[PDB]
Amino acid sequence: PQITLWKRPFVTVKIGGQITEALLDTGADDTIIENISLPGRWKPKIIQGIGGFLKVRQYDQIPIEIEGHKVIGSVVVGPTPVNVIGRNVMSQLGATLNF
Amino acid sequence: PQITLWKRPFVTVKIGGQITEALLDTGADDTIIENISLPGRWKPKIIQGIGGFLKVRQYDQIPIEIEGHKVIGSVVVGPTPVNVIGRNVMSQLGATLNF
């Protein structure tokens, strides 16, 4: 789709057999989604949380569907004020900024 | 232009007769630029900072040129880890996310 920027650019996300929503955030390198369970092996990852560093999980090679478009990418599972789709997954979508 | 998302989407910004760069950040409502002087009137603005509420300046009706495109918009002048072009100004440029 074409997403205008007149409001926060939230998108429907299907991941881990669940439907949620997340913000398309070109200011974020990584994708972070809270309160979803993902299968298999993860790697430790540090994010800045409320208070200090939080130790959370990074899952690789995860199928994600964003507004109906299927990609595979890395997802951080951890506390976040809002779910965020970062540039890692947007680049897998072939997403571009245009003006 | 068309900007891909494999790397941080920085753009050249001409504002207050100065040249700087800033990050196109669809996760940010407001545009915030450090260490520029803007002419005339601003309205006092409070933002969350490290340690404080930070008292910064909101300037309205500021000419800004981004990758050579000329718009008018609102700019917050205040401390920021990276200069950010938010959705307010991206909406003035007519920027869209596309995939």
DSSP string, chain A: -EE-SSS--EEEEEETTEEEEEEE-TT-SS-EE-S----S--EEEEEE-SSSEEEEEEEEEEEEEETTEEEEEEEEES--SS-EE-HHHHHHHT-EEE-
Asked if B96 and A94 come within 8 Å (Cβ–Cβ), the reply is: no
Asked if A99 and B94 come within 8 Å (Cβ–Cβ), the reply is: yes
Q: How far is CA A75 from CA A54, B21, B26, B96, in A?
A: 16, 29, 19, 24
SS3 assignment, position B69? strand
Nearest to B9 among A4, A23, A26 (CB): A26
- On the 0-12 / 13-18 / 19+ scale of CB atoms within 10 A, A16 is middle
Report the alpha-carbon distance of residue A23 to residue A5 in Å, rounded. 11
User: A38, A34, A54: which is closest to A46 by C-alpha?
Assistant: A54
Report the alpha-carbon distance of residue B73 to residue B86 in Å, rounded. 11
Asked if B93 and A87 come within 8 Å (Cβ–Cβ), the reply is: no
Q: Which of A12, A24, A93, A97 to mutate to test the interface with B (most CBs of B within 10 A)?
A: A97
Residues of B that are catalytic: 25
How many Cβ atoms from other residues are within 10 Å of residue B47's Cβ?
A: 16
Question: What residue ranges do the domains of chain A occupy?
Answer: 1-99
Rounded to the nearest 5°, which phi and psi values hold at A17? 65, 15
CA atoms within 13 A on the CB side of A1: 12
Asked if B27 and B88 touch (Cβ cutoff 8 Å), the reply is no
- On the 0-12 / 13-18 / 19+ scale of CB atoms within 10 A, B7 is exposed
Report the alpha-carbon distance of residue B90 to residue B9 in Å, rounded. 12
Enumerate residues preceding breaks in chain A (C to N > 2.5 Å): none
Asked if A90 and A44 touch (Cβ cutoff 8 Å), the reply is no
Give A91's contacts in chain B (Cβ within 8 Å): 4-6
Asked if A40 and B38 touch (Cβ cutoff 8 Å), the reply is no
Report the alpha-carbon distance of residue A87 to residue B4 in Å, rounded. 9
Counting one residue from A and one from B, how many pairs have CB atoms under 8 Å apart? 100
Report the alpha-carbon distance of residue B96 to residue A44 in Å, rounded. 34
Experimental method: X-ray
Resolution of this model in Å is 1.6
